[PDB]
Structure formats: C-alpha cells, structure tokens
Design an enzyme around this catalytic site. Structure first.
Site, mmCIF file in Angstrom:
data_model
loop_
_atom_site.group_PDB
_atom_site.id
_atom_site.type_symbol
_atom_site.label_atom_id
_atom_site.label_comp_id
_atom_site.label_asym_id
_atom_site.label_seq_id
_atom_site.Cartn_x
_atom_site.Cartn_y
_atom_site.Cartn_z
ATOM 1 N N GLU A 35 -15.514 56.853 -49.994
ATOM 2 C CA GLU A 35 -15.808 58.199 -49.411
ATOM 3 C C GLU A 35 -15.387 59.346 -50.301
ATOM 4 O OE1 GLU A 35 -17.698 59.106 -47.111
ATOM 5 O OE2 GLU A 35 -17.800 57.472 -45.657
ATOM 6 N N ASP A 48 -27.121 69.958 -43.209
ATOM 7 C CA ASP A 48 -27.038 70.683 -41.969
ATOM 8 C C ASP A 48 -26.050 71.839 -42.105
ATOM 9 O OD1 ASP A 48 -24.571 69.447 -41.757
ATOM 10 O OD2 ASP A 48 -25.012 68.306 -39.947
ATOM 11 N N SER A 50 -22.850 71.515 -42.621
ATOM 12 C CA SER A 50 -21.520 71.083 -42.339
ATOM 13 C C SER A 50 -20.929 70.597 -43.672
ATOM 14 C CB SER A 50 -21.439 70.017 -41.274
ATOM 15 O OG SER A 50 -22.068 68.886 -41.801
ATOM 16 N N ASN A 59 -16.198 65.127 -41.073
ATOM 17 C CA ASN A 59 -17.195 66.166 -40.910
ATOM 18 C C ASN A 59 -16.801 67.329 -40.050
ATOM 19 O OD1 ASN A 59 -20.064 66.972 -39.409
ATOM 20 N ND2 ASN A 59 -20.128 66.791 -41.677
#
EC number: 3.2.1.17
Length: 129
Positions: A35, A48, A50, A59
């Site tokens: 990640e 989006d 975010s 998120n």
C-alpha cells in the site's frame, strides 16, 4: 518514517493486529508493503477527489477528515494527518474499524490483488516476534 519489515511486524503485533478478525500478521505486513512501501508518510490522491493516507492508505472519503473531501464521513474520528505519524497507533485503531466493516481485508485493493491467497507468512519470516 519508513519501517523495516520486522520492525513493523513487531509494532503491529504489539498493537493487537495479529489474527485480528482472523487475519494473520503476515497479511497486515503484506498489505503495508504494497500500500505504501512501509512509509507512514505515503499519500495518494484518487479520482473521486479523496486521498489515501499512511502505511495502510486509509481513505478520506470514509475514514478520516482532511478538510477537502466533500461528503467525508470521518468514521475513525481523526484528522487524516494523524495517519502519517511515526507512531502507528491511530492507523492501527482505524484499520481495526475498517476490517470489522464487512468486507474484511478486501477493503484494501493491494491486499486483494497482491496478498490474498499468497504465502503471506513469508512476510514475517525471520522476525523475532
């Protein structure tokens, strides 16, 4: 802070993530590797609008407040910047809420794509735990 593999494993362990919700330690480490490459300062913006923060790339649409995600829900009740600290505590607390949410670790795309179904035990091999 960029963690070492074993160092992270020990901290997550110490923070109660081993087998939390049935996910062994190596799943957690594997997810962090993919990640953020073990960097607590990792951020990545999404389409989006975010942004994903920290070692587990949590998120801002649902989990934390960054002040620039309209409609954020702030489920972990924290500012997203708390997820970039060298102390993984807020990340860990927030991750436990996430994993408990229904889809388990599938919430983490890199986990689903790169960790799930693999020999994740490899991630904690050789560590003193």
């Amino acid at each position: 802070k960029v963690f070492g593999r074993c160092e992270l494993a020990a901290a997550m362990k110490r923070h109660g993530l081993d087998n939390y919700r049935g996910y062994s330690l190596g799943n957690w480490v594997c997810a962090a590797k993919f990640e953020s490459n073990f960097n607590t300062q990792a951020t990545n913006r999404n389409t989006d609008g975010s942004t994903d923060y920290g070692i587990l790339q949590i998120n801002s649409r649902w989990w934390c407040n960054d002040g620039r995600t309209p409609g954020s829900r702030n489920l972990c009740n924290i500012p997203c910047s708390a997820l970039l600290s060298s102390d993984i505590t807020a990340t860990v607390n927030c991750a436990k809420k996430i994993v408990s949410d229904g889809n388990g670790m599938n919430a983490w795309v890199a986990w689903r794509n790169r960790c799930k179904g693999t020999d994740v035990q490899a991630w904690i091999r050789g560590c003193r735990l």
